[model samples]
Target: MDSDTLSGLLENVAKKFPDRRALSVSGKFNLTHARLHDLIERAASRLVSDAGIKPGDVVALTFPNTVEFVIMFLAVIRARATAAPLNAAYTAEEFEFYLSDSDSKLLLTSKEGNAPAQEAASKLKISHVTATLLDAGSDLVLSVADDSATELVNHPDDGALFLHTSGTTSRPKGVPLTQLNLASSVKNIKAVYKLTESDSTVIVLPLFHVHGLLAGLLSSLGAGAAVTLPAAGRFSATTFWPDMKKYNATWYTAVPTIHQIILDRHASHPETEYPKLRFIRSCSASLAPVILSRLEEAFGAPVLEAYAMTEATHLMSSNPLPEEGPHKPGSVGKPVGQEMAILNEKGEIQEPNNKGEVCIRGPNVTKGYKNNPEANKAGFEFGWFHTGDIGYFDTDGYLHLVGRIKELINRGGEKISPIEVDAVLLTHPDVSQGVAFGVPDEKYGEEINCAVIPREGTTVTEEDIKAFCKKNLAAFKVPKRVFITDNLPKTASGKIQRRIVAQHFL
Candidate 1:
């Protein structure tokens, strides 16, 4: 069984497999279980001694998917501090908002980091700690920074991670996950896949996100398995297969868009021989039926489809291992650690085949949104966390997702709120009314597009709106396609339905 807290879990794994490889980076850097533990302890001591991090203080982490990220995450949690990992792509404005909102004490970044993070920390007058690579391997130190606290001070329910969910219409909502919540999700992932010490996973997802932290890193280490980090900072289709084969990787997990890219590249090459590949896992977004079959046929492994959200600590449900594959291709399979049920709008549980919102209740599920009573009251009901996803349970108990009750765009697995994009376009001088929606995409499952009405006596081009958005939003959040018109469709209450926005424009 996995430990209730992250520190306990790591200590157990290290003692059992001290000499075994714990983390590998770019095939050039490697760290044994013993070495990782030492670094984690030393780093934790530095945080308390030099950085003055307390038990419940929040520390913002700004780094890409690298070995340093993993070490910082573990060290902060071990020091009884909350790790608030932010996207490295955030603009200065975004960073400022997150830093101020979370009331972070410090921001940790790499030596070769970007300026927005430093500026954000300076703007908030918080400590900005930088780490440099001490050697070629996955070993580093806190640049300017120990009786190390051997025992963990945090309880099971103490907050370990502070994150925000993309609120489609309003500002992002804080979702502070406790030690018990994260540990339970990691245990569920280990149980769902029957993870073992011999298994090695090729991690391609961003470490800052819950999907990568819980499913890819925590679960693998919890099972006493090794994690191979990509050489590049981000996922690349070209390097994916080469690394998988070279590292003798048993499995890997990624979103649908990355999987599609890999599949496309595999088709252009010869019939590949994956000597050690065990199974492929897809999560974070909808996995198309066609892509599922293609992945299974090409890789000679089950494409385990999964469903998750930040509120659930990332992993909610996933398809079974191949033999147990009760493997319904379009279905997201059975609930792993939580009790799942379909609930009607009236908060009543629905029977099999009844389409309704998916609700889950378990230790893995978050207690509630942090400091947001209205969101908490609206989200939790009858002791179940409403998932906001419309799905149904089949006769065999597998889950089939139908649609979303929320109007957020899932472009390549990244959640982009339409209202956020709409607000950006509205900032333009010529745009009077703006709305964003998801358009059917062959590779990404959903791509962002927008429609805008011009202000009276003002002339605006589609290119004009696109240029304006590029200045204000992240690259992924910017609308890929723009449409201009004089009027937009509205309902009886004069509210525009986001669902039909794309249809009307397209």
Candidate 2:
């Protein structure tokens, strides 16, 4: 009975703004709202009829920030199947783990194909298909038999998107977000920023991440606004301003890493005229006040910082627009379209300025982690979903994040589990024991480093361990610095304490 699902919302917007531009790749193609909707419907039909995708089925998608990804992701959800978007940069091992964990029925990639994902899917005996748009304004061609298409419907509670988020545990937790969660998050983002048909933005983050998917693309589309992707399918310093100017971009959202890159670009290669953007948004990582001021001064727009996570479907709280009120620098601003509170260990709501665990409950928040009863029990308590982020609300009702209750490391916007990195290092035959920890970093907010104890009668240098890690782990997850030590600091019971190990090595 609910008509506010993601597909429903987009359908309404397509009807309301049929002729307006919805998705675009710079210098490649521009799809109108009606055209985008038609393409999504066409592709969704093929997925159900040809690929045998059924309701609640998981379809794994691996693509860069291309138009194909946008269409295929929508089509999967539109067909009442969950779309699990994996990072294109993931290794075969990483891909295999995610594909198996999600119980994906099919793996969809670009026409060129993702070797790692394809290999993983093949190993798991999952069907693999390539999707292609022959040309601009053409039908999405899936590499499957063209069967007669039938209509499919999606319910509000239907699983729409599946994502894995790093937590306290070494194994990442799978978060199954419902159609209602996606819709609610899109609405919250659109409302907080007052996005409209007049608003347009350039997407700089990868679509696989919630920040780029919900806050950047989905929110813009839900508001009937325009979204432009870079021609390179990723963020580029050289072409950023040009794309912004070419597409008449009104605003853009990114983590602090990209913000610094943009700022660096401005300093190194000055632009003749920057686009007249409505405002700039910073999220997923903490943005320093100095950087915020510099960005606003340079870009001639208000730089609003927000707090978000995958479990919340992306945005939880964001600084408001200029017309709404003052945008605080360090504070993540008031809760938007959700109930938020700072709760203590006993589940009591903390008073203003009292630091405690940030808990939230809303339609946007996921019900629980998929297949993890322990995580579910620990995450949901006192009638609220614990965020594991330690923060306090100021007197003005703005939330300020101080630290994290969890041991995960926040590198730029990418959350990395220290335990995950430790496991990779331990896999090395020469390493007897190892522990990874985060170090204070200027550019990425936190950089990963690990200390390893070489096994007796074996020799492993720092470079050797790093090289091995490069082969096994993603580029970002690999330790930036590796310390070869005999013994690591441990607890009285001989258990390694990551914080103590970091202190001892550093």
Candidate 3:
């Protein structure tokens, strides 16, 4: 049996299953075990021997979701280096900031965005950044296994994937997930989802985020299943169904909003009319209960809501698909891979149903964010990853998220969750997407406010929105101010960037 480390697991998986297809997109292009080995070899050669990468040295890659991401990802590990992948949407200024902050020596970028990273590289006074535009037929493969005997980089630590925090509140902090961590997460997904050789998924999530990188792509590889990726552009519900049908995708993992769009479209159509998917997964945020009924009725599929965090590789708990009572609507199900609990201010474990901060301690959880002692002190307590999410466990041990601890709306004294208010507002036929937050106030310190981006052409006045809330929410929970907007600002990874929303009003 292979150890929990990602590097060890990778070495074992390659040796054990060399003939298996490690990854594939478009159902045709793929890298078998031998091919994946060679690909990682080449990527590692480019970064380590060729680019002078070293242990603990950060290598930032600004590439798309392709074989390169996976190739370079493993390459960084083999070279005893750290791979810090970033989104291409970041400006040169942002690039320079991270490059300097990470103390990066070299950068690996695609042909398209190579100039920005290179320009930013110059300003940061870092070493050379190579831009290798890997095309469909481009040939750039380096041999690592054979050349390991002749002058090669070796593992300094259990080097593995490095990602950043969600940065919902402040600047993002680096979270280094060890190989053991990634393997644990992949194993948890494989066991819970019951992924087999026959399963195939269409991966649409971005490569920069962990949801797409480890959970979506790595899980498929771990299960020996294939994945189909589409041409990159804006994600639309109109084209989504057609794509699923075209790919004959057995299953797909996506966000709750994406599922909601498909449900709304099937209002007049039969559930069985669309492609028969094996299962539909929702993750990355709290899954709304309101969307569950329509999703099940519309898609003729069971919705699996998973609870996860970046520190925990990707997933912690998941509702087992097509099971008897494993599907808990409004419940993230029981803790699957890691040890989960709720704790109070005194760090004492709270009884079930007692509202407290969610906490987890397991192999999947990262040790700490890189070089962030202050954040690590606040986030990691007594070897447990203390999630500021305010949630509780039911009698059946299923998790129910009431709201976020930071985003909670405190009216005088009573704590009101945005989720409660948002669900009530979403019940209004006219309102499409709504978020309630506590805004700064003179008298109350913080007063309730809402910024809603309704469906196009939906006439929802301030009074109309308020009247609906008034009839539904308590006097204090109702918004003191309402601002109709076009869209809620989101991160490159599709998470609600709440800080930006607050800054917009300020």
Candidate 4:
């Protein structure tokens, strides 16, 4: 089929299954494979002709989980432009930083428009457009003027997607994934799950993140399978099962946060007949063994845990299908379509069951972070991509992740850099010193807590510090508890130890 690029893969699938349903909005209309391909082509043509989007230009998109987002995302990449999908929940300041960092030529949003995103775009002097598709057979209408038509196609090495990932540094690093990376990851996911035309899924995760974008949408589309988006444009516990049952969903993938919500909903309001799921997939964070066992017992499906990162284009390793092998509850399973190894400090591969840094190399991995030489130097050491995760492979070849080498706070699946939070906390006028750290949490795998020392003789309450943080940081990044203390723990070298601060405060 010569499907080395995302555009090539979609074109191949459309030719094979033209009349099959490809994408749908629950309680709305559906687009067949042929129709989806046609729309992508039309939209791509309009983007190049109307918006003047060049081959290497970055177009930032801010939309929820909707059909419009899917079409525009594919269209942007199809026209050989890099698609930068930003989280819709970001504040104006966050949007401004990301939009400026990506060097975005244009910002695209829904018809209603995101005020924060629009504000950022306006401040950056970037053009903005609103896109909407009234119906399944309707044209994708954009606010920008339309003109002549031109044909544009992407190559295997063409950058298709750009995303910002949290790192040990205070500033997030930008990751660029090529068309080949997307295609390779799609193939790996489909092969591991044995996806086919008969399989269908309802997406519960947002389309901006790699986990939802690749595993939840692109893989299904590449396989000529069906995908449904929630009507509300986001996941809702009440409507989740009804959408699944109505769409005849075969399986679904989500983070552990969503899984726990599903389980809690089932216990509170039990479904009379749950959909017959082929298997449930969990990724983007650790899935506890207790939660895994509970999911299998409650849903009557094998629970598969996966390990992934934005730099890998999503899928690195995942527990295989039931027929291939036993699904391990605690392990992330064997590597798929990649070469993985656990290496110690000296760059020597560790033997089985020996803990070390997780490293990987494959077609799906990114070449390096965009414009970050320091990160690239450290991440690309030993001729492999260092994952910064402390993990080991069992004797049975299953990978088990124990901890992270970096001090990132994993609040559920959202990776938060404590350094970023600490910087924000220190920005307050009354704050003299601050350190943020993660503590064990029941709802989220970990919760953020911080200790701050106010300026000498300055009266600053915990509530004041929290309110300051709330204004400067995202809700999730805001520390749940703030410790206002004068004396804080430090190392002998006078450097602040976040772990020590957490322990002393806790």
User: Can you give the TM-score per candidate against the true fold?
Assistant: 0.81, 0.81, 0.89, 0.81
Clashing pairs in 2: none
lDDT of each: 0.81, 0.86, 0.73, 0.87
Which 10-residue span in candidate 1 carries the lowest summed lDDT? 490-499
TM-score pick, better of 1 and 2: 2
Q: Among these predicted structures, which one has the highest lDDT?
A: 4
Candidate 1's residue-wise lDDT over 1-506, tens digit each? 46897678878899998888788886677888888888888788888888888889999999877878888888899899889999898899999999988889999998887699889889889888886556645446787542665755767877799888644334668989998988899889999998888888877777877887888888889888998888886777777778777766899988765675577678677445765577889887666666677788888887788999889999999899977766886789999978999988787889999988999999988899878898899889767898888889998889988656666678788777664576577568676567778888898888999998886788998888888899889888888888888888752112356666767777
- Which stretch of 10 consecutive residues in model 2 shows the poorest summed lDDT? 488-497
Error of 4 at 217 (Å): 0.5
- Identify the runs in model 1 with alpha carbons over 4 angstroms from their true place: 136-139, 167-171, 270-272, 407-506
RMSD of 3: 3.4
Residues 1-506 of candidate 2 have per-residue lDDT tens digits of 11469999999999999999999999989999999998999999899888998899999999999999999999999999999999888889989999999989999999999999898888889999999987754799999986223456679999999998733324568999999999999989998999999889999888888998998899999999999999999888899899999999999998865786688689779898888888999987566666687799999999998999889999999899989989987778999989999989988899999988999999999999999999899889755899888889999999988656556688999877664576577668777667788888999999899998886789988899999999988899889999888776532112355666777777
In candidate 1, list every pair of residues with a backbone clash.
Answer: none
Q: After aligning candidate 2 to the native by TM-score, how far in Å is the CA of 230 from where it should be?
A: 0.8
Report the error of model 3 at residue 120, Å.
Answer: 1.0
What lDDT tens digits, residue by residue, belong to model 3 across residues 1-506?
A: 24465655555666767777666544346666566766676666666666666666777777776665566777777776777787777788988988877767777764454677778988877765434424445545432222431255344246466787788865777888776788888888878888765677767677778887776777776666665555452355565666677656678887766666666667535345577777888888766677776677767778889888788888988787775466887778878778899989988888889989899988888988888898889988777998878889988888888777888877677788887777777777787777777777777777788888787777888888998899987788888778888888777677665557777866
